[PDB]
Amino acid sequence: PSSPNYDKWEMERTDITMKHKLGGGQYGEVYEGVWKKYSLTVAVKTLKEDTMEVEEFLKEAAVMKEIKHPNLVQLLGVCTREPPFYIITEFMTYGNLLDYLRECNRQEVNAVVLLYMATQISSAMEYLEKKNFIHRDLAARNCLVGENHLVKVADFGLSRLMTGDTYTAHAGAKFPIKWTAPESLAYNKFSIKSDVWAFGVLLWEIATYGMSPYPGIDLSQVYELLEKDYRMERPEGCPEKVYELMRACWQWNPSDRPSFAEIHQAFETM
Ligand SMILES: CC(C)(C)c1cc(NC(=O)Nc2cccc(Cl)c2Cl)n(-c2ccc3c(c2)C[C@@H](C(=O)O)NC3)n1
Fold first, then answer.
1. Does 4-92 match 93-270 in CATH topology?
2. Which residues carry this modification: Phosphoserine?
3. Ligand 1 centroid vs 233 CA: distance in angstroms?
4. Closest ligand 1 atom to Cα of 31
């Protein structure tokens, strides 16, 4: 603290022991680490080369210092002095939520756990809304599961890392089409209300244990279908009030969609 200039986030590289990369590789340069002096497992995001990709890294770190919520990824410290630069967060032990849902025992991860996981996310988004932060890529793949069904919303920059049809072209721009609000597809602008759309698809994800949205529909077909008022059907075993919440998040006009504050209230009140 005595230091005049000072940064409470900056700390010692040699405190962290870096293990192998996470999620094999399809989540980018994010590593398992141990912060030995605390016996804490961590997730470390590094930056190689001299590069001027450096600007983004420092944006990310500056965003994360602002964000403080039990259901949002939490910055534990950084290393910016010398290469590689490090962003350090707590390791969520069960990995991403999509795979967690797909690979889980449904008796242990039963319907109340699903609804508890959904309430955690809605609460995270309530906080972000209050902060006026637009997430832009909300999806199970960007949520993380920790101990005892703790869920945290993150953003792994997955549009530049995932191969396949998750991120695709629509009218000459790139989108995770299945999570994308119609006005975002058509006008390439985003809002908290477009995150609300994403939230409704994420709900459907949770409710189906990680099925790919719009089954039976060709991707080139979703905009036209949404415009004709097609929406996904209620998943098997999904609570009536949860499906109604989905259908509200998927109102054509952004102004008819609930706020996240309202979405959380629906969870409290259901
Ligand atoms: C809104 C909120 C969910 C709080 C969030 C969380 C992160 N970031 C993050 O969750 N990062 C992370 C995840 C797991 C493990 C680690 Cl070690 C980290 Cl650092 N951002 C974030 C901020 C800025 C940037 C990115 C991500 C990604 C990066 C890119 O364009 O590629 N551009 C800048 N916004």
1. no
2. 3, 220
3. 32
4. 17
**Does 200 carry a binding-site annotation?**
no
- Resolution of the coordinates, Å: 2.3
Contact 187, 193 (CB under 8 A): no
At 142, list the tokens: 């960007």
- What technique solved it? X-ray
Say yes or no: domain 93-270 is CATH 1.10.510.10: yes
State the angle between helix axes of 260-269 and 192-207 in degrees (0 to 180), rounded to the nearest 10.
40
Ligand 1 pocket test: pick from 64, 68, 143 the residue with the most ligand atoms within 8 Å of its Cβ. 64
Q: Active site includes 137? A: yes
Beta strand 30-35 with 75-79 is unpaired
Tokens matching residue 161: 């890392």
Q: What's the gap in Å between 234 CA and the centre of ligand 1?
A: 32
Active-site pick, 137, 165, 229, 256: 137
The label of the residue with tokens 């979703």 reads 222
Residue 88 forms beta bridges with which residues? 44, 77
Among all chains, which residue has been given the structure tokens 């809605």?
122
Q: What is the CATH number of domain 4-92?
A: 3.30.200.20
Q: What's the full length of the chain, in residues?
A: 270
